[PDB]
Design an enzyme around this catalytic site. Structure first.
Site, PDB file in Angstrom:
ATOM      1  N   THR A  67      34.485  45.878  46.345  1.00 16.79           N
ATOM      2  CA  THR A  67      33.209  46.213  46.390  1.00 16.79           C
ATOM      3  C   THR A  67      32.138  46.820  45.399  1.00 16.79           C
ATOM      4  O   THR A  67      33.045  47.642  44.822  1.00 16.79           O
ATOM      5  CB  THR A  67      32.772  46.626  47.768  1.00 16.79           C
ATOM      6  OG1 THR A  67      33.845  46.289  48.927  1.00 16.79           O
ATOM      7  CG2 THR A  67      31.268  46.720  48.339  1.00 16.79           C
TER       8      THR A  67
ATOM      9  N   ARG B 274      29.677  50.715  39.776  1.00 17.77           N
ATOM     10  CA  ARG B 274      30.104  51.444  41.193  1.00 17.77           C
ATOM     11  C   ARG B 274      30.559  52.894  40.747  1.00 17.77           C
ATOM     12  O   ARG B 274      31.515  52.850  39.519  1.00 17.77           O
ATOM     13  CB  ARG B 274      30.835  50.790  42.178  1.00 17.77           C
ATOM     14  CG  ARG B 274      31.465  51.634  42.898  1.00 17.77           C
ATOM     15  CD  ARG B 274      32.326  50.596  44.082  1.00 17.77           C
ATOM     16  NE  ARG B 274      33.481  51.486  44.558  1.00 17.77           N
ATOM     17  CZ  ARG B 274      34.581  50.995  45.402  1.00 17.77           C
ATOM     18  NH1 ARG B 274      34.635  49.424  45.481  1.00 17.77           N
ATOM     19  NH2 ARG B 274      35.409  51.775  45.793  1.00 17.77           N
TER      20      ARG B 274
ATOM     21  N   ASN C 143      38.914  45.075  55.445  1.00 19.85           N
ATOM     22  CA  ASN C 143      37.828  45.893  54.968  1.00 19.85           C
ATOM     23  C   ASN C 143      36.649  45.243  54.247  1.00 19.85           C
ATOM     24  O   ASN C 143      35.553  45.084  54.628  1.00 19.85           O
ATOM     25  CB  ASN C 143      38.262  47.165  54.162  1.00 19.85           C
ATOM     26  CG  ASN C 143      37.196  48.130  53.785  1.00 19.85           C
ATOM     27  OD1 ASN C 143      36.194  48.224  54.643  1.00 19.85           O
ATOM     28  ND2 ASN C 143      37.200  48.718  52.540  1.00 19.85           N
TER      29      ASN C 143
HETATM   30  C1  TPP Z   1      41.990  49.259  42.475  1.00 15.90           C
HETATM   31  C2  TPP Z   1      40.907  48.767  43.859  1.00 15.90           C
HETATM   32  N1  TPP Z   1      40.636  47.598  43.783  1.00 15.90           N
HETATM   33  C3  TPP Z   1      39.853  47.145  44.895  1.00 15.90           C
HETATM   34  C4  TPP Z   1      39.494  47.971  45.847  1.00 15.90           C
HETATM   35  C5  TPP Z   1      38.577  47.479  46.852  1.00 15.90           C
HETATM   36  N2  TPP Z   1      39.542  47.371  48.316  1.00 15.90           N
HETATM   37  C6  TPP Z   1      39.692  48.643  49.046  1.00 15.90           C
HETATM   38  S1  TPP Z   1      40.750  48.175  50.191  1.00 15.90           S
HETATM   39  C7  TPP Z   1      40.464  46.673  49.955  1.00 15.90           C
HETATM   40  C8  TPP Z   1      41.364  45.488  50.768  1.00 15.90           C
HETATM   41  C9  TPP Z   1      42.145  46.337  52.143  1.00 15.90           C
HETATM   42  O1  TPP Z   1      43.096  45.529  52.411  1.00 15.90           O
HETATM   43  P1  TPP Z   1      44.118  45.931  53.301  1.00 15.90           P
HETATM   44  O2  TPP Z   1      44.996  46.658  52.287  1.00 15.90           O
HETATM   45  O3  TPP Z   1      44.866  44.617  53.704  1.00 15.90           O
HETATM   46  O4  TPP Z   1      43.592  46.867  54.617  1.00 15.90           O
HETATM   47  P2  TPP Z   1      42.975  46.331  55.935  1.00 15.90           P
HETATM   48  O5  TPP Z   1      41.248  46.435  55.694  1.00 15.90           O
HETATM   49  O6  TPP Z   1      43.079  44.864  56.089  1.00 15.90           O
HETATM   50  O7  TPP Z   1      42.991  47.053  56.941  1.00 15.90           O
HETATM   51  C10 TPP Z   1      39.958  46.278  48.778  1.00 15.90           C
HETATM   52  C11 TPP Z   1      39.787  44.899  48.320  1.00 15.90           C
HETATM   53  C12 TPP Z   1      39.795  49.228  45.792  1.00 15.90           C
HETATM   54  N3  TPP Z   1      39.301  50.452  46.563  1.00 15.90           N
HETATM   55  N4  TPP Z   1      40.465  49.620  44.483  1.00 15.90           N
END
Ligand code: TPP
Ligand code: SF4
Ligand code: SF4
Ligand code: SF4
Ligand code: MG
Lengths: 1163, 166
Positions: free
Chosen positions: A28, A111, A999
């Site tokens: 995001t 961001r 998320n």
């Molecule tokens: C280095 C980095 N890349 C991308 C993100 C954005 N980001 C945060 S959580 C997330 C996905 C969360 O997936 P998951 O680990 O499966 O947790 P869930 O929401 O499914 O419980 C992303 C794409 C980030 N915060 N930091």
């Protein structure tokens, strides 16, 4: 053509046309770029090379950056989209891509970086952290500029061989919807330097004309080789300038490396970058028209910084300059742009007073009144330097005073705000309304949408603008012509009518008549309506949706009401455009669903009623506020103002300097968003506490009490005799928290009684009764009970230390974490990865983790998305060190003249400091003897006891828990998770496997199964699910377990206790149903039962301790499935949308081979 | 030290010898099923290396070749570097296998164990390299425990590869 897009779509539009490959990883607010590019490829959109763009998702942004580097060196034009922490992980490869002079464009929705706290919102911190990589940096200030400057970056990088970062303000521009001129792909191809593309192909790695790149160099040639690229950087400004002339000739819009706006003889000038330039120019027009000699320099090309192009647009009359940076470099002399401007002016001997300030961090509002405050500081006798704007800094006094409020909005611009409820259709309708107005009138149209941290039932505020002039208002609406409230509950809760203009419109959705208005509307709202002579309209949209058969959906109804009164377009034309959009949205739903939405439009026109209010409403007087309860300082000074949408008024002195927050603060929210709540039937209850186990919000719990403690109980607090030898002579009651319940209905579905002991009744009908019931159950004293915690019933009598979080109704994740706190929460530390569990677990200012009656509870920390395993690993080292320091002082106490009982407890603790139960038993003994032992000591012996008391919080052995989602465990953090498990440390890893990125909206992961449809897997995921548990079993000394609460409560209990007691690394992979699966969240537990019964999710336990006992470490807890695998896929939308048949057959074959392999490990 | 360092081997950041066993990279890559995985050692079998290189490159998919590469950091006579790789496979220290996903599509077993029965002593191979003998010179009481674990882990690894082939 003219289309209404946001910054992300505008950027992806150009990136798609100009690129062959796009290697991405979602973050995001940049991930919408990669999502829409994937959709366009899925439908066969052709780039300027006649092909579809190839979109490849990596395991992280580091993997994406390396793929960009390899794709470029091998001869493919490649782009990517990223932001914030993602841009940081790409920095190492950015040095290589620039060092090798590869044409490239990174599109960044700028961001904030995670510092004292995570922030998904916009500033330039991420881009500024890469300004030394050798990338060029081009800034877009509006959605139109995102379209234009994206094309400039792609065209310039081919000519210059210098890669570009093209960035625009996160959310403030990336998610701002605007009607813009869209550049045709065919026109892009007419400007491309095709010779430069062919020369790029000749430099590619190819075995038929090979070369070597990326060598290692000694000191003799490295410096010279590094300076050999200087001509390319010296030429890039002129190349970018010439490309800007190409775009100008095509579009008519003239960009320069630096652009000037304002008085030709201005004496005070602001230098700025990004969307702030729009706000400043609008203010400059207003001030210049009033006679002030002010101006603005917009920085487009930040790197390379061309002094020649900066000075050419600087008027000779400038005496004072304020530079605005959307970043903070703590301890620096100044921020980057300020130091550039100060440097260039010194290099050319300009005698200009320069001052630097900071603004808009984390999407902090930056409006015209703040712009004037910057201009006023330039007009002071001594301008303040190193200032801030948009906050009240009462600690270090850096903030500028906002003296007066100005309205610089161009005359003729219509302004509307829409207060909506989460997922009630308001935002979607407003986006459609902007599309309608933009597509069918000459007016410019703008939309910006403010979202909430709560995933369900949150507040949304839409900001829309339409006008005959270009809309440069990159800020929230101050004076609205129309304000719409789509949720009557907001009446009396939020300042809805704030800033509405005299004679403006107020549209309300409610069931209240004109006479009930006097009693329902607050006095302040009635005063505003009367004094400003507002046109007050009301509509019972729920009544219309009920009678037509649309349920409670009011999106079509409220949109129809808006056009009926807004007078933006002819009402007859609006009705056609709405029905045309209904055909586009509901044409595939069927004929019956279509005509219902047609009837919604028709009935909405006739139901809109103007409220003729008495003029005496202007003199109404507030009612005497009740005697408020004494709440803690944090709740009173921080939590309430933030929830009241007033957090921007909080000065700097409000906050801790390091982002540390209290625990147990969600219990003060009491949102009361449930439509139905479980009502307990005492006669049907078997006292099994399974309802308390599955509640994703800890809103329903069992309560035991001695009959004497039921004295002041309300008459409705009906209890039952307690079943069980442990609770003999006690009373039992299953009590729900009505204001904390979400109405999900999991507890009623899990209730295993013959006749349901929990029935869903409307909240409003029983809310007054159950509030008194919950208030009495919550104040009941603690009851010492000997129920076995290893059972489901016994564990639920332990207090939940995770309560009332912001997770969705029926979330499949929080019940796992809630259960862990009920078993070991007294002594556990949590390292939580970024994701859903960090959003509902740690979104400021409310903490769902709480303490027990002794004040003990989980300590919670979230570092990054990629580092969570190593984060908790470091915690384990520190805790072990702190226990070693405590053990050293206790061993010294054995040589000290202290009481025999103290030495007895010390020897017992030293022998069992590494056992959870024994360390608590002897630890609590030492704590009981310490105050008396210190009193009887003196001198150095007293100090030895005081050092034990100083460290008494490490007597009880701690339980380190590393919690995160499948995206963390399977992808970005897998390398770190693998290392921590291999290390052998005594940590407990809990992977909440939702098989998607929950998320960020549901993107693909390695935990996604075959055929499952998610973002970046539009046609279904071909590769099978990666078996994280199987790879962890290869070490042999890692405890691995696969659990699913909905399938087996006892198997979940067995694996959790075995994993925590195991003196080594433990991995718990928990099946967590999610809203992204496309199922009824009421039956979230039931879906996990069908998953195991259909062979879709396995249940096993791998215990390394069994190997030392001569037994088989692998135990298959569910051997023979009884349900059809193909039928389970049919119960979730994430698989039915594929219908495609080939993927369903592949998914079933992989489930049989995985089950047969688990049979081999057990046999 | 690396995760590929075996039990008892002495390297930097592993002054007292590496306790945890070698990470089995080949085993984890075989869990996908569609990755060609092969363990080779030129000094042990020239023909087996020819077999894996050609199969891996012709396989239309991802291929992983884990090659035993003798090094000066092992503490051996580099004149007999090829011979040192032969003693590694003959002592059960390094396996020779090939995991061919295409054999699974033909209804056959994808895993082929190219060396089933070792004929040399496991400890005698460890004493022929300085990276293991320096452990016996440092802590004699702890060296015998680490050498016994390394041989027990190598037999459990050999028994696991025999099970995948049977
Ligand atoms: C280095 C980095 N890349 C991308 C993100 C954005 N980001 C945060 S959580 C997330 C996905 C969360 O997936 P998951 O680990 O499966 O947790 P869930 O929401 O499914 O419980 C992303 C794409 C980030 N915060 N930091
Ligand atoms: S309905 Fe859902 S949120 Fe409410 S008590 Fe039951 S399980 Fe908890
Ligand atoms: S699930 Fe039903 S029977 Fe069991 S404790 Fe809850 S209300 Fe009582
Ligand atoms: S995991 Fe799914 S259900 Fe739970 S909070 Fe996140 S999106 Fe909602
Ligand atoms: Mg997930």
């Amino acid at each position: 053509p003219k289309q209404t897009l946001d910054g992300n779509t505008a950027a992806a539009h150009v990136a798609y046309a100009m690129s062959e490959v796009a290697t991405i990883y979602p973050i995001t607010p940049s991930s919408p770029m990669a999502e829409i590019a994937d959709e366009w490829a899925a439908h066969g959109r052709k780039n300027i090379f006649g092909k579809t763009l190839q979109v490849a998702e990596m395991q992280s942004e580091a993997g994406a950056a390396g793929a960009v580097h390899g794709s470029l060196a091998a001869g493919a034009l490649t782009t990517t989209f990223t932001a914030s922490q993602g841009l940081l992980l790409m920095i190492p490869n950015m040095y290589k891509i620039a060092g090798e002079l590869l044409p490239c464009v990174f599109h960044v929705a700028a961001r904030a970086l995670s510092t004292h706290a995570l922030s998904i919102f916009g500033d330039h911190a991420d881009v500024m952290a890469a300004r030394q990589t050798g990338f060029a940096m081009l800034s877009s200030a509006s959605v139109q500029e995102v379209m234009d400057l994206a094309l400039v970056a792609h065209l310039a990088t081919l000519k210059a061989r210098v890669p570009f970062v093209h960035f625009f303000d996160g959310f403030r521009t990336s998610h701002e919807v605007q009607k813009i001129d869209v550049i045709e792909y065919e026109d892009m191809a007419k400007l491309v330097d095709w010779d430069a593309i062919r020369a790029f192909r000749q430099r590619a790695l190819n075995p038929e004309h090979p070369h070597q790149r990326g060598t290692a160099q000694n000191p003799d040639i490295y410096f010279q080789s590094r300076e050999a690229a200087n001509p390319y950087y010296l030429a890039t400004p002129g190349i970018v300038a010439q490309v800007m002339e190409q775009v100008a000739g095509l579009t008519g819009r003239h960009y320069h490396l630096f652009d000037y706006a304002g008085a030709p003889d201005a004496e005070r000038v602001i230098v700025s970058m990004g969307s702030s330039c729009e706000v400043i120019e609008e203010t400059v027009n207003y001030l210049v028209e009033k006679g002030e000699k002010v101006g603005l320099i917009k920085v487009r090309l930040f790197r390379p910084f061309s002094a020649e192009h900066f000075l050419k647009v600087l008027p000779a009359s400038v005496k004072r300059i304020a530079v605005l940076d959307r970043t903070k470099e703590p301890g620096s002399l100044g921020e980057p742009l300020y130091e550039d401007v100060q440097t260039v002016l010194a290099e050319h001997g300009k005698n200009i007073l320069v001052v630097g300030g900071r603004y808009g961090l984390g999407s902090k509002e930056f409006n015209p009144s703040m712009v004037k405050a910057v201009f006023d500081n330039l007009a002071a006798t001594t301008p303040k330097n190193k200032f801030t704007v948009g906050i009240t800094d009462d600690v270090t006094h850096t903030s500028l005073e906002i003296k007066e409020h100005i309205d610089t909005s161009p005359k003729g611009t219509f302004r509307c705000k829409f207060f909506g409820l989460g997922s009630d259709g308001t935002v979607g309708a407003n986006k459609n309304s902007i599309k309608i107005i933009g597509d069918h009138t000459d007016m410019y149209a703008q939309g910006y949408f403010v979202y909430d941290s709560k995933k369900s039932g949150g507040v949304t505020i839409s900001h829309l603008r339409f006008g005959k002039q270009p809309i440069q208002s990159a800020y929230l609406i101050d004076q609205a012509d129309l304000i719409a409230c789509h949720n009557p509950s907001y009446v009396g809760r939020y300042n809805l009518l704030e800033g509405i203009k005299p004679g403006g419109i107020f549209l309300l959705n409610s069931t209240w008549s004109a006479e009930e208005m006097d009693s329902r509307l607050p006095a302040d709202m009635k005063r505003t309506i009367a004094t400003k002579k507002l046109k007050f309209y009301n509509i019972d949209a729920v009544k219309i949706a009920q009678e037509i058969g649309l349920g409670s959906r009011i999106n079509v109804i409220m949109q129809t009401a808006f056009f009926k009164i807004a007078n933006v377009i002819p009402v007859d034309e609006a009705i056609k455009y709405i029905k045309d959009s209904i055909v586009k949205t509901y044409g595939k739903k069927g004929d019956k669903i279509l005509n219902m939405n047609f009837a919604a439009v028709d009935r909405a026109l006739e139901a809109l009623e103007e409220i003729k209010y008495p003029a005496s409403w202007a003199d109404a007087v507030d009612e005497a506020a009740a005697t408020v309860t004494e709440e803690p300082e944090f709740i009173q000074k921080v939590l309430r103002p933030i929830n009241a949408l007033k957090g921007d008024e909080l000065p700097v002195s409000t906050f801790t300097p390091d982002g540390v927050f209290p625990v147990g603060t969600t219990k003060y929210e009491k949102r009361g968003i449930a439509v139905n709540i479980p009502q307990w039937q005492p006669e049907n209850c078997i006292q099994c506490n399974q309802c308390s186990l599955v509640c994703p919000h800890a809103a329903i719990r069992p309560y035991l009490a001695k009959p004497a403690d039921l004295a002041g109980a309300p008459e409705t607090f009906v209890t039952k005799d307690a079943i069980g030898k442990e609770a003999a002579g006690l009373k039992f009651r299953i009590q729900v928290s009505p204001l904390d319940c979400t109405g999900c209905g999991n507890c009623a579905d899990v209730c295993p009684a013959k006749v349901k002991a929990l029935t869903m009744v409307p909240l409003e009908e029983v809310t007054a009764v159950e509030e008194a019931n919950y208030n009495f159950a919550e104040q009941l004293p603690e009851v010492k009970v000997n129920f076995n915690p290893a059972t489901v019933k016994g564990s639920q009598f332990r207090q939940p230390l995770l309560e009332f979080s912001g997770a969705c109704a029926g979330c499949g994740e929080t019940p796992y974490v809630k259960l862990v706190t009920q078993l070991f929460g007294d002594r556990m530390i949590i390292a939580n990865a970024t994701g859903c569990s960090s959003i509902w677990g740690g979104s400021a200012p409310a903490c769902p983790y709480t303490v027990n009656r002794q004040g003990h509870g989980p300590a919670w920390a979230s570092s990054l998305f990629e580092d969570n395993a190593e984060f908790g690993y470091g915690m384990a080292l520190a805790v072990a060190k702190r226990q070693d320091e405590l053990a050293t002082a206790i061993s010294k106490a054995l040589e000290a003249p202290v009481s025999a009982a103290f030495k007895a407890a010390c020897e017992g603790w030293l022998a069992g400091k590494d056992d959870a139960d024994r360390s608590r038993e002897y630890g609590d003994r030492i704590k009981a003897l310490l105050p008396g032992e210190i009193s009887q000591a003196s001198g150095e012996v007293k100090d030895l006891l005081l050092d034990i008391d100083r460290q008494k919080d490490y007597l009880t052995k701690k339980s380190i828990w590393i919690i995160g989602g499948d995206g963390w465990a399977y992808d970005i953090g897998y390398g770190g998770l693998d290392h921590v498990l291999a290390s052998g440390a005594n940590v407990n890893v809990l992977v909440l496997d939702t098989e998607v990125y929950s998320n960020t909206g549901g993107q693909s992961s390695k935990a996604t199964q075959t055929g499952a449809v998610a973002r970046f897997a539009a046609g279904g995921k071909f590769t099978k699910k990666k078996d994280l548990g199987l790879m962890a079993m290869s070490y042999g000394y890692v405890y691995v377990a696969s659990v699913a609460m909905g399938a087996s409560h006892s198997q979940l209990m067995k694996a959790l206790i075995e994993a925590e007691k195991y003196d080594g690394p433990s991995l718990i992979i928990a099946y967590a149903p999610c809203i992204n699966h496309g199922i009824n969240m009421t039956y979230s537990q039931r879906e996990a039962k069908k998953a195991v019964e259909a062979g879709y999710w396995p249940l096993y336990r791998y215990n390394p301790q069994l190997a030392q006992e001569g037994k088989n470490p692998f135990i298959l807890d569910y051997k023979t499935p009884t349900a059809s695998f193909r039928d389970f896929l049919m119960g979730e939308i994430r698989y039915t949308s594929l219908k495609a048949e080939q993927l369903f057959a592949k998914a079933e074959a992989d489930a049989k081979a995985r089950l047969e392999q688990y049979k081999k490990l057990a046999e | 030290s690396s995760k590929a360092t075996q039990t008892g081997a002495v390297a930097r950041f592993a002054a007292g010898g590496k306790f945890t066993k070698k990470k089995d990279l080949g085993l984890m890559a075989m869990s996908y099923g569609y990755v060609y995985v092969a363990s080779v050692a030129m000094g042990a079998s020239h023909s087996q290396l020819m077999k894996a290189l050609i199969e891996a490159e012709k396989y239309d998919g991802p291929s992983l070749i884990i090659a035993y590469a003798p090094c000066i950091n092992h503490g051996i006579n580099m004149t007999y570097s090829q011979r040192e790789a032969k003693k590694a496979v003959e002592a059960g220290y390094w396996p020779l296998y090939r995991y061919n996903p295409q054999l699974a599509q033909e209804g056959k077993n994808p895993f082929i164990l190219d060396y089933k029965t070792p004929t040399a002593s496991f400890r005698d191979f460890l004493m022929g390299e300085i990276r293991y003998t320096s452990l016996k010179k440092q802590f004699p009481e702890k060296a015998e425990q680490l050498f016994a674990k390394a041989e027990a882990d190598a037999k459990a690894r050999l028994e696991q590869y025999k099970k995948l082939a049977e």
